[PDB]
Amino acid sequence: MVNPTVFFDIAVDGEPLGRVSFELFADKVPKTAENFRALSTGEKGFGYKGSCFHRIIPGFMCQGGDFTRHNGTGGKSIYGEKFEDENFILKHTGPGILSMANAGPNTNGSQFFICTAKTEWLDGKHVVFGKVKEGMNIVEAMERFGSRNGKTSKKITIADCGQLE
């Protein structure tokens, strides 16, 4: 079978920016990939639609997925509780990597980041579960609204999201 693909339609201060799509490595990290896929479709009744990228650091990453508190302090997985680091097979190889944010071992929720550089120091600490497929330029455009401390200068939202194919 085939790894799922999901998309995010991004907006900046409500104005459309573009679409970013991702391959989810369900072949390597099925549990992690499924969480992100389900939160993208909204099939459990909650997920990423309408949420924001609250922390963006140019040259580093864009982070989002806190759909409950909108600031890095919230979010939840589809598993009724934070969940474990499934494995660290996949590495932070370069721009476009999709990896889970966490607050220490086995604390995955819904927060994630999209790398804009190779972030090898996170290997073995954050679970890598996907990669941008199309629209890396859109992520580069988003990145320009970040700053040193991560605060964004315009509100970057996931206007729509779902599963492709």
Summarize the structure in words.
- With 165 residues, this protein is an alpha+beta fold.
- It has a single domain (1-165), classed as Cyclophilin-like (Cyclophilin, Beta Barrel), CATH 2.40.100.10.
- Helices cover 12% and strands 30% of the residues.
- The chain has two helices and eight strands, in the order ββαβββββαβ.
- It has helices at residues 30-41, 136-143, and strands spanning 5-12, 15-24, 55-57, 61-64, 97-100, 112-115, 128-134, 156-164.
- Strands 3-4-6-5-7-2-1-8 form an eight-stranded antiparallel sheet.
- Strand 1 (5-12) and strand 2 form a beta hairpin.
- The radius of gyration is 14 Å and the shape is globular.
- It is classed as isomerase.
- Keywords: ligand complex, beta barrel, prolyl CIS/trans isomerase, cytosolic, Isomerase.
- The assembly is monomeric.
- The entry is titled "Structure of cyclophilin A in complex with hexahydropyrimidin-2-one".
- The protein is Peptidyl-prolyl cis-trans isomerase A.
- Organism: Homo sapiens.
Would you kindly provide a brief summary of this structure?
The chain is of the alpha+beta class and 165 residues long. The protein has one domain: Cyclophilin, CATH 2.40.100.10. It has helices at residues 30-41, 136-143; strands at residues 5-12, 15-24, 55-57, 61-64, 97-100, 112-115, 128-134, 156-164.
